Protein backbone atom coordinates (compact mmCIF):
# COMPACT_ATOMS: atom_id res chain seq x y z
CA UNK A 1 0.00 0.00 0.00
CA UNK A 2 1.02 3.65 0.57
CA UNK A 3 4.16 3.70 2.67
CA UNK A 4 6.71 6.33 3.61
CA UNK A 5 10.04 5.00 4.88
CA UNK A 6 13.49 6.35 5.77
CA UNK A 7 16.41 4.02 5.04
CA UNK A 8 19.94 3.81 6.45
CA UNK A 9 22.87 2.09 4.79
CA UNK A 10 25.98 1.71 6.93
CA UNK A 11 29.25 0.44 5.45
CA UNK A 12 32.48 -0.55 7.25
CA UNK A 13 33.08 3.90 6.91
CA UNK A 14 30.50 5.65 4.71
CA UNK A 15 26.85 6.25 5.64
CA UNK A 16 23.75 6.86 3.52
CA UNK A 17 20.32 8.28 4.42
CA UNK A 18 17.25 8.69 2.25
CA UNK A 19 13.50 9.06 2.64
CA UNK A 20 11.09 7.40 0.25
CA UNK A 21 7.37 7.44 -0.40
CA UNK A 22 6.99 3.84 -1.56
CA UNK A 23 9.13 3.42 -4.66
CA UNK A 24 9.43 7.17 -5.09
CA UNK A 25 12.26 9.06 -3.39
CA UNK A 26 11.32 12.36 -1.72
CA UNK A 27 14.20 13.10 0.65
CA UNK A 28 18.00 13.05 0.50
CA UNK A 29 20.58 13.68 3.23
CA UNK A 30 23.56 15.92 2.38
CA UNK A 31 26.71 14.29 3.80
CA UNK A 32 28.89 17.43 3.77
CA UNK A 33 26.56 20.00 5.40
CA UNK A 34 24.11 17.78 7.35
CA UNK A 35 20.87 18.91 5.72
CA UNK A 36 17.61 17.31 4.62
CA UNK A 37 17.32 17.82 0.85
CA UNK A 38 13.83 18.15 -0.63
CA UNK A 39 13.58 16.59 -4.13
CA UNK A 40 10.09 17.97 -4.68
CA UNK A 41 8.66 21.35 -3.59
CA UNK A 42 6.00 19.36 -1.77
CA UNK A 43 8.79 17.13 -0.42
CA UNK A 44 8.19 19.07 2.82
CA UNK A 45 4.42 18.64 3.23
CA UNK A 46 2.58 19.76 6.39
CA UNK A 47 5.61 20.74 8.34
CA UNK A 48 7.20 24.19 8.43
CA UNK A 49 10.77 25.52 8.31
CA UNK A 50 10.79 25.74 12.09
CA UNK A 51 9.97 22.09 12.46
CA UNK A 52 12.08 20.78 9.61
CA UNK A 53 15.22 22.35 11.08
CA UNK A 54 14.26 20.79 14.42
CA UNK A 55 13.92 17.34 12.84
CA UNK A 56 17.02 17.63 10.69
CA UNK A 57 18.87 18.49 13.91
CA UNK A 58 17.35 15.50 15.69
CA UNK A 59 18.46 13.31 12.78
CA UNK A 60 22.00 14.60 12.96
CA UNK A 61 22.52 13.88 16.65
CA UNK A 62 20.74 10.54 16.73
CA UNK A 63 22.53 9.19 13.66
CA UNK A 64 25.91 10.24 15.08
CA UNK A 65 25.13 8.58 18.46
CA UNK A 66 24.13 5.42 16.62
CA UNK A 67 27.09 5.48 14.25
CA UNK A 68 29.88 6.15 16.75
CA UNK A 69 27.91 3.88 19.07
CA UNK A 70 28.75 0.91 16.84
CA UNK A 71 32.53 0.88 16.26
CA UNK A 72 32.32 1.52 19.99
CA UNK A 73 30.57 -1.83 20.38
CA UNK A 74 31.66 -3.50 17.18
CA UNK A 75 34.21 -5.60 19.04
CA UNK A 76 31.99 -6.46 21.98
CA UNK A 77 29.34 -7.56 19.52
CA UNK A 78 30.46 -10.42 17.31
CA UNK A 79 30.36 -8.13 14.29
CA UNK A 80 33.55 -8.73 12.31
CA UNK A 81 34.82 -6.57 9.42
CA UNK A 82 33.68 -5.82 6.91
CA UNK A 83 29.92 -5.58 7.48
CA UNK A 84 26.78 -3.63 6.56
CA UNK A 85 23.91 -2.41 8.75
CA UNK A 86 20.55 -1.52 7.14
CA UNK A 87 17.73 0.31 8.88
CA UNK A 88 14.25 1.00 7.53
CA UNK A 89 11.66 3.00 9.46
CA UNK A 90 8.31 4.59 8.81
CA UNK A 91 4.56 4.13 8.62
CA UNK A 92 1.92 3.11 6.09
CA UNK A 93 -1.66 3.88 5.04
CA UNK A 94 -4.40 1.44 4.08
CA UNK A 95 -6.85 3.48 1.97
CA UNK A 96 -6.36 6.87 3.63
CA UNK A 97 -5.93 5.55 7.17
CA UNK A 98 -2.95 4.94 9.52
CA UNK A 99 -2.33 1.21 9.11
CA UNK A 100 0.50 0.96 11.66
CA UNK A 101 4.25 1.66 11.69
CA UNK A 102 7.65 -0.11 11.66
CA UNK A 103 11.37 0.03 12.29
CA UNK A 104 13.68 -2.85 11.38
CA UNK A 105 17.44 -3.30 11.51
CA UNK A 106 19.42 -5.76 9.39
CA UNK A 107 22.82 -7.34 9.87
CA UNK A 108 24.55 -8.47 6.65
CA UNK A 109 21.29 -8.69 4.70
CA UNK A 110 19.33 -10.76 7.21
CA UNK A 111 16.92 -9.51 9.93
CA UNK A 112 18.49 -8.66 13.28
CA UNK A 113 16.36 -6.47 15.55
CA UNK A 114 12.92 -4.92 15.30
CA UNK A 115 11.29 -2.12 17.24
CA UNK A 116 7.97 -3.29 18.70
CA UNK A 117 5.73 -1.56 21.23
CA UNK A 118 8.06 0.55 23.30
CA UNK A 119 11.30 -1.41 22.90
CA UNK A 120 13.68 -3.44 20.73
CA UNK A 121 13.03 -7.12 20.02
CA UNK A 122 15.38 -9.67 18.47
CA UNK A 123 14.38 -11.82 15.54
CA UNK A 124 14.66 -15.36 16.94
CA UNK A 125 16.54 -16.35 13.77
CA UNK A 126 19.45 -13.95 14.30
CA UNK A 127 20.55 -15.83 17.42
CA UNK A 128 22.13 -14.81 20.72
CA UNK A 129 24.06 -11.74 19.62
CA UNK A 130 20.78 -10.16 18.48
CA UNK A 131 19.41 -10.83 21.96
CA UNK A 132 22.46 -9.05 23.32
CA UNK A 133 22.09 -6.10 20.97
CA UNK A 134 18.59 -5.42 22.35
CA UNK A 135 19.83 -5.56 25.94
CA UNK A 136 22.09 -2.67 24.98
CA UNK A 137 19.53 -0.52 23.17
CA UNK A 138 16.75 -1.12 25.72
CA UNK A 139 19.09 -0.03 28.53
CA UNK A 140 18.03 3.58 28.24
CA UNK A 141 14.28 3.80 27.93
CA UNK A 142 14.12 7.52 27.23
CA UNK A 143 15.86 6.70 24.00
CA UNK A 144 13.02 4.28 23.30
CA UNK A 145 10.36 6.88 24.19
CA UNK A 146 11.75 9.22 21.47
CA UNK A 147 11.92 6.44 18.85
CA UNK A 148 8.35 5.59 19.77
CA UNK A 149 7.05 9.16 19.47
CA UNK A 150 8.48 9.51 15.96
CA UNK A 151 7.08 6.22 14.69
CA UNK A 152 3.61 6.54 16.12
CA UNK A 153 2.84 10.26 16.13
CA UNK A 154 5.36 12.26 14.09
CA UNK A 155 5.41 9.98 11.06
CA UNK A 156 1.61 9.55 10.74
CA UNK A 157 1.03 13.28 10.89
CA UNK A 158 3.74 13.74 8.34
CA UNK A 159 2.77 11.22 5.66
CA UNK A 160 -0.77 12.58 5.64
CA UNK A 161 0.53 16.05 4.96
CA UNK A 162 2.87 14.83 2.25
CA UNK A 163 0.09 12.95 0.49
CA UNK A 164 -2.11 16.06 0.43
CA UNK A 165 0.85 18.22 -0.58
CA UNK A 166 1.72 16.30 -3.71
CA UNK A 167 -1.81 15.33 -4.78
CA UNK A 168 -0.92 17.00 -8.08
CA UNK A 169 2.05 14.65 -8.60
CA UNK A 170 0.72 11.33 -7.31
CA UNK A 171 -3.01 10.63 -7.99
CA UNK A 172 -2.15 11.65 -11.58
CA UNK A 173 -2.87 9.35 -14.55
CA UNK A 174 -0.33 8.68 -17.32
CA UNK A 175 -1.69 6.58 -20.22
CA UNK A 176 0.45 3.53 -21.17
CA UNK A 177 1.99 2.68 -24.55
CA UNK A 178 1.46 -0.80 -25.99
CA UNK A 179 3.25 -2.84 -28.70
CA UNK A 180 4.02 -6.50 -29.64
CA UNK A 181 7.14 -8.57 -30.45
CA UNK A 182 8.83 -11.98 -30.73
CA UNK A 183 10.91 -13.29 -27.84
CA UNK A 184 13.60 -15.95 -27.93
CA UNK A 185 12.47 -19.13 -29.67
CA UNK A 186 11.32 -21.63 -27.02
CA UNK A 187 11.99 -24.45 -29.45
CA UNK A 188 11.24 -25.55 -32.98
CA UNK A 189 7.73 -24.77 -34.20
CA UNK A 190 7.01 -22.43 -31.31
CA UNK A 191 7.05 -18.73 -30.49
CA UNK A 192 7.19 -16.36 -27.60
CA UNK A 193 4.63 -13.60 -28.00
CA UNK A 194 5.66 -10.52 -26.06
CA UNK A 195 3.31 -7.74 -25.01
CA UNK A 196 4.95 -4.47 -24.08
CA UNK A 197 3.31 -1.92 -21.81
CA UNK A 198 5.54 1.07 -21.14
CA UNK A 199 5.46 4.42 -19.36
CA UNK A 200 2.36 4.00 -17.22
CA UNK A 201 1.45 5.62 -13.89
CA UNK A 202 0.23 4.69 -11.28
CA UNK A 203 1.91 1.31 -10.85
CA UNK A 204 -0.97 -1.22 -10.66
CA UNK A 205 -1.71 -2.73 -14.05
CA UNK A 206 -3.42 -5.70 -15.75
CA UNK A 207 -1.93 -7.40 -18.82
CA UNK A 208 -3.15 -10.73 -20.19
CA UNK A 209 -3.00 -12.73 -23.42
CA UNK A 210 -6.42 -13.52 -24.83
CA UNK A 211 -8.19 -15.80 -27.25
CA UNK A 212 -11.21 -13.60 -27.65
CA UNK A 213 -12.49 -13.70 -24.08
CA UNK A 214 -10.56 -16.86 -23.25
CA UNK A 215 -8.01 -15.50 -20.77
CA UNK A 216 -4.91 -17.57 -21.56
CA UNK A 217 -3.26 -19.00 -18.47
CA UNK A 218 0.43 -19.47 -19.08
CA UNK A 219 0.55 -15.75 -19.72
CA UNK A 220 3.65 -14.86 -17.81
CA UNK A 221 4.05 -11.53 -16.06
CA UNK A 222 7.54 -10.03 -15.78
CA UNK A 223 9.22 -7.60 -13.40
CA UNK A 224 7.64 -4.15 -13.21
CA UNK A 225 10.59 -2.02 -14.31
CA UNK A 226 11.23 1.65 -13.36
CA UNK A 227 12.44 4.64 -15.35
CA UNK A 228 13.71 8.04 -14.16
CA UNK A 229 10.36 9.67 -14.97
CA UNK A 230 8.57 7.61 -12.33
CA UNK A 231 6.66 5.64 -14.94
CA UNK A 232 6.66 1.86 -15.19
CA UNK A 233 7.39 -0.74 -17.86
CA UNK A 234 6.21 -4.35 -18.05
CA UNK A 235 6.43 -7.43 -20.32
CA UNK A 236 3.83 -10.18 -20.45
CA UNK A 237 4.77 -13.24 -22.47
CA UNK A 238 3.10 -16.40 -23.82
CA UNK A 239 4.62 -19.44 -25.48
CA UNK A 240 2.59 -20.89 -28.32
CA UNK A 241 2.85 -23.19 -31.29
CA UNK A 242 3.24 -21.15 -34.47
CA UNK A 243 -0.26 -21.84 -35.78
CA UNK A 244 -1.98 -20.88 -32.55
CA UNK A 245 -0.60 -17.38 -32.81
CA UNK A 246 -2.88 -15.41 -35.17
CA UNK A 247 -5.94 -16.27 -33.01
CA UNK A 248 -4.33 -14.34 -30.14
CA UNK A 249 -4.54 -10.78 -28.80
CA UNK A 250 -3.22 -8.74 -25.88
CA UNK A 251 -5.48 -6.95 -23.41
CA UNK A 252 -4.24 -4.12 -21.18
CA UNK A 253 -6.26 -2.68 -18.29
CA UNK A 254 -5.11 0.46 -16.48
CA UNK A 255 -6.71 3.20 -14.40
CA UNK A 256 -6.02 5.87 -17.06
CA UNK A 257 -7.90 4.01 -19.81
CA UNK A 258 -11.16 4.50 -17.84
CA UNK A 259 -12.89 1.36 -19.15
CA UNK A 260 -11.56 1.55 -22.71
CA UNK A 261 -8.93 -1.20 -22.64
CA UNK A 262 -6.00 -1.54 -25.03
CA UNK A 263 -6.34 -4.54 -27.33
CA UNK A 264 -3.54 -5.61 -29.68
CA UNK A 265 -4.17 -8.43 -32.13
CA UNK A 266 -1.15 -10.47 -33.25
CA UNK A 267 -2.11 -9.81 -36.89
Amino acid sequence: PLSFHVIWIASFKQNLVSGWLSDLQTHTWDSNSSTIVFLWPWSRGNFSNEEWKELETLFRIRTIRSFEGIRRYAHELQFEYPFEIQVTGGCELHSGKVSGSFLQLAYQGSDFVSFQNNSWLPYPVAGNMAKHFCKVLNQNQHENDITHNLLSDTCPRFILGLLDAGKAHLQRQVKPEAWLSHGPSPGPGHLQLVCHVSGFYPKPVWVMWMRGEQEQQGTQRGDILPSADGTWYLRATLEVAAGEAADLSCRVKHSSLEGQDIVLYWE
Partner: T-cell receptor, first 114, second 111 residues
Framework: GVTQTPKFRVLKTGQSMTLLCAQD?????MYWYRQDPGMGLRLIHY???????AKGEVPDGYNVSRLKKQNFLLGLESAAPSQTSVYFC??????????????FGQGTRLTVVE | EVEQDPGPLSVPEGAIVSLNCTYS??????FMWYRQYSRKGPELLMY????GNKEDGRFTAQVDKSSKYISLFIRDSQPSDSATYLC?????????????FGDGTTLTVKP
Protein backbone atom coordinates in the same frame (compact mmCIF):
# COMPACT_ATOMS: atom_id res chain seq x y z
CA GLY B 1 24.32 25.41 36.58
CA VAL B 2 22.07 28.23 35.32
CA THR B 3 22.78 31.75 36.55
CA GLN B 4 20.98 35.10 36.13
CA THR B 5 22.30 38.62 36.55
CA PRO B 6 21.15 40.86 38.12
CA LYS B 7 18.99 39.32 40.85
CA PHE B 8 17.07 42.53 41.61
CA ARG B 9 16.35 45.76 39.76
CA VAL B 10 14.27 48.97 40.00
CA LEU B 11 13.31 50.92 36.82
CA LYS B 12 11.77 54.29 36.18
CA THR B 13 9.04 54.01 33.57
CA GLY B 14 10.57 54.23 30.14
CA GLN B 15 14.08 53.10 31.13
CA SER B 16 15.83 50.16 29.53
CA MET B 17 17.61 47.12 30.90
CA THR B 18 19.37 43.95 29.83
CA LEU B 19 19.20 40.69 31.82
CA LEU B 20 21.87 38.11 31.22
CA CYS B 21 21.53 34.34 31.55
CA ALA B 22 24.46 32.01 31.36
CA GLN B 23 24.84 28.22 31.63
CA ASP B 24 28.01 26.11 31.47
CA UNK B 25 26.04 22.93 30.88
CA UNK B 26 26.41 22.90 27.12
CA UNK B 27 22.66 23.22 26.52
CA UNK B 28 21.26 23.94 23.07
CA UNK B 29 17.82 25.23 24.24
CA MET B 30 17.40 28.42 26.37
CA TYR B 31 14.29 30.25 27.60
CA TRP B 32 13.13 33.50 29.22
CA TYR B 33 9.95 33.29 31.34
CA ARG B 34 8.11 35.80 33.44
CA GLN B 35 6.05 34.77 36.46
CA ASP B 36 3.46 36.97 38.11
CA PRO B 37 2.44 36.05 41.69
CA GLY B 38 -0.11 33.27 41.94
CA MET B 39 0.34 32.45 38.24
CA GLY B 40 2.75 30.12 36.49
CA LEU B 41 5.43 30.68 33.89
CA ARG B 42 4.72 32.42 30.59
CA LEU B 43 7.44 32.14 27.90
CA ILE B 44 8.68 35.47 26.52
CA HIS B 45 11.33 34.35 24.01
CA TYR B 46 13.47 31.27 23.48
CA UNK B 47 16.43 30.05 21.41
CA UNK B 48 17.14 26.65 19.86
CA UNK B 49 20.84 27.35 19.41
CA UNK B 50 23.53 29.94 18.87
CA UNK B 51 22.44 32.93 16.82
CA UNK B 52 18.79 32.08 16.40
CA UNK B 53 15.85 33.18 18.61
CA ALA B 54 12.04 32.90 18.56
CA LYS B 55 8.91 34.41 20.10
CA GLY B 56 7.08 32.81 23.00
CA GLU B 57 3.57 33.41 24.29
CA VAL B 58 4.12 36.93 25.61
CA PRO B 59 6.99 38.44 23.53
CA ASP B 60 5.82 42.05 23.25
CA GLY B 61 8.04 44.72 24.81
CA TYR B 62 10.98 42.37 25.10
CA ASN B 63 13.83 41.33 22.81
CA VAL B 64 16.52 38.66 23.06
CA SER B 65 20.00 37.90 21.88
CA ARG B 66 21.64 34.47 21.83
CA LEU B 67 25.24 35.61 21.65
CA LYS B 68 27.19 32.48 22.49
CA LYS B 69 25.90 29.02 23.31
CA GLN B 70 26.35 29.96 26.98
CA ASN B 71 24.57 33.33 27.06
CA PHE B 72 21.00 34.38 26.45
CA LEU B 73 20.26 38.10 26.96
CA LEU B 74 16.82 39.60 27.66
CA GLY B 75 16.14 43.22 26.97
CA LEU B 76 13.47 45.63 28.05
CA GLU B 77 13.01 48.15 25.29
CA SER B 78 11.03 50.63 27.40
CA ALA B 79 10.02 49.76 30.96
CA ALA B 80 6.32 49.83 31.80
CA PRO B 81 4.61 49.16 35.15
CA SER B 82 3.10 46.03 33.60
CA GLN B 83 6.60 44.53 33.30
CA THR B 84 6.98 44.42 37.10
CA SER B 85 7.40 40.67 37.57
CA VAL B 86 9.86 37.88 38.29
CA TYR B 87 11.91 36.67 35.35
CA PHE B 88 13.30 33.13 34.95
CA CYS B 89 15.92 31.89 32.59
CA UNK B 90 15.95 28.21 31.73
CA UNK B 91 17.98 25.86 29.62
CA UNK B 92 17.91 22.24 28.57
CA UNK B 93 19.61 19.87 26.10
CA UNK B 94 18.11 19.54 22.61
CA UNK B 95 17.66 15.82 22.86
CA UNK B 96 18.14 14.98 26.56
CA UNK B 97 18.76 11.34 27.40
CA UNK B 98 17.60 11.14 30.98
CA UNK B 99 14.12 12.51 30.30
CA UNK B 100 12.52 15.88 29.63
CA UNK B 101 12.39 18.84 32.01
CA UNK B 102 14.38 22.09 32.04
CA UNK B 103 16.85 23.67 34.52
CA PHE B 104 15.88 27.02 36.06
CA GLY B 105 17.66 30.10 37.34
CA GLN B 106 16.82 31.48 40.75
CA GLY B 107 15.05 34.43 39.20
CA THR B 108 15.20 38.15 38.70
CA ARG B 109 12.86 40.36 40.63
CA LEU B 110 12.18 43.52 38.65
CA THR B 111 9.96 46.42 39.70
CA VAL B 112 8.95 49.32 37.43
CA VAL B 113 7.97 52.62 39.11
CA GLU B 114 6.73 55.96 37.80
CA GLU C 1 -4.56 25.16 27.64
CA VAL C 2 -3.75 23.70 31.04
CA GLU C 3 -6.17 24.20 33.96
CA GLN C 4 -4.74 23.50 37.37
CA ASP C 5 -6.45 23.51 40.77
CA PRO C 6 -5.83 27.00 42.09
CA GLY C 7 -5.80 25.98 45.73
CA PRO C 8 -4.31 26.97 48.04
CA LEU C 9 -4.14 23.68 49.97
CA SER C 10 -3.57 23.42 53.68
CA VAL C 11 -3.22 19.83 54.84
CA PRO C 12 -2.08 18.25 58.07
CA GLU C 13 1.21 16.43 58.22
CA GLY C 14 0.78 12.79 57.28
CA ALA C 15 -1.97 13.43 54.76
CA ILE C 16 -2.09 12.16 51.22
CA VAL C 17 -2.11 15.17 48.95
CA SER C 18 -3.47 15.07 45.42
CA LEU C 19 -2.46 17.71 42.85
CA ASN C 20 -4.21 17.80 39.49
CA CYS C 21 -4.12 19.29 36.02
CA THR C 22 -6.58 19.11 33.19
CA TYR C 23 -5.78 19.87 29.55
CA SER C 24 -7.73 20.30 26.34
CA UNK C 25 -5.06 19.58 23.71
CA UNK C 26 -4.79 15.88 22.90
CA UNK C 27 -1.43 16.34 21.22
CA UNK C 28 0.24 16.57 24.67
CA UNK C 29 2.61 13.65 25.30
CA UNK C 30 5.24 14.78 27.79
CA PHE C 31 4.19 15.60 31.32
CA MET C 32 6.34 17.43 33.85
CA TRP C 33 5.75 18.32 37.47
CA TYR C 34 7.84 21.13 38.95
CA ARG C 35 8.16 22.06 42.60
CA GLN C 36 8.95 25.71 43.43
CA TYR C 37 9.85 26.84 46.96
CA SER C 38 9.20 30.41 48.12
CA ARG C 39 11.41 33.02 46.52
CA LYS C 40 13.31 30.40 44.49
CA GLY C 41 13.11 28.83 41.01
CA PRO C 42 11.11 25.87 39.61
CA GLU C 43 12.79 22.50 40.11
CA LEU C 44 11.79 19.41 38.14
CA LEU C 45 10.14 16.92 40.50
CA MET C 46 8.56 14.24 38.24
CA TYR C 47 8.47 13.53 34.49
CA UNK C 48 6.41 10.95 32.61
CA UNK C 49 6.09 9.92 28.95
CA UNK C 50 2.52 9.38 27.73
CA UNK C 51 -0.08 7.34 29.66
CA GLY C 52 0.83 5.76 32.96
CA ASN C 53 2.21 5.95 36.47
CA LYS C 54 5.72 6.49 37.77
CA GLU C 55 6.53 6.06 41.47
CA ASP C 56 9.50 7.83 43.03
CA GLY C 57 9.54 7.51 46.84
CA ARG C 58 6.51 9.22 48.38
CA PHE C 59 5.61 10.63 44.95
CA THR C 60 3.43 9.16 42.24
CA ALA C 61 2.91 10.90 38.95
CA GLN C 62 -0.09 9.77 36.98
CA VAL C 63 -1.27 10.54 33.47
CA ASP C 64 -4.63 9.64 32.05
CA LYS C 65 -4.65 10.64 28.35
CA SER C 66 -8.24 9.63 27.59
CA SER C 67 -9.53 11.70 30.51
CA LYS C 68 -6.91 14.39 29.92
CA TYR C 69 -6.15 14.38 33.59
CA ILE C 70 -2.82 14.24 35.31
CA SER C 71 -2.10 13.99 39.01
CA LEU C 72 0.76 14.26 41.41
CA PHE C 73 0.22 12.27 44.62
CA ILE C 74 2.29 12.90 47.70
CA ARG C 75 2.20 10.22 50.39
CA ASP C 76 2.86 10.94 54.08
CA SER C 77 3.27 14.66 53.39
CA GLN C 78 6.03 16.32 55.37
CA PRO C 79 6.08 20.08 56.21
CA SER C 80 9.14 20.24 53.91
CA ASP C 81 6.69 19.66 51.06
CA SER C 82 5.22 23.12 51.45
CA ALA C 83 5.70 24.74 48.08
CA THR C 84 4.14 25.57 44.76
CA TYR C 85 3.68 22.73 42.35
CA LEU C 86 3.50 23.50 38.67
CA CYS C 87 2.60 21.14 35.92
CA UNK C 88 3.93 21.48 32.42
CA UNK C 89 3.23 19.62 29.18
CA UNK C 90 4.83 19.30 25.69
CA UNK C 91 3.26 18.03 22.48
CA UNK C 92 4.70 15.29 20.26
CA UNK C 93 7.95 15.87 18.38
CA UNK C 94 8.73 18.17 16.74
CA UNK C 95 7.64 20.22 19.79
CA UNK C 96 10.17 23.08 19.55
CA UNK C 97 11.38 22.26 23.06
CA UNK C 98 8.39 24.27 24.28
CA UNK C 99 6.16 23.37 27.23
CA UNK C 100 2.90 24.88 28.61
CA PHE C 101 2.58 25.57 32.35
CA GLY C 102 -0.47 25.35 34.57
CA ASP C 103 -0.73 28.38 36.87
CA GLY C 104 0.45 26.25 39.83
CA THR C 105 -1.08 25.11 43.14
CA THR C 106 0.38 26.29 46.47
CA LEU C 107 0.51 23.61 49.18
CA THR C 108 1.03 24.24 52.88
CA VAL C 109 1.68 21.23 55.10
CA LYS C 110 0.83 22.03 58.74
CA PRO C 111 3.26 20.36 61.16
Amino acid sequence: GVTQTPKFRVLKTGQSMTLLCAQDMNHEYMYWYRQDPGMGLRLIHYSVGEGTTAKGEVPDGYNVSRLKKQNFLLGLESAAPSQTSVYFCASRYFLPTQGMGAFFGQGTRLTVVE
Amino acid sequence: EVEQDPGPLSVPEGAIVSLNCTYSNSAFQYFMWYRQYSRKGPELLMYTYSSGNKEDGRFTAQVDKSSKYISLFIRDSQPSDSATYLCAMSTSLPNAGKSTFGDGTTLTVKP
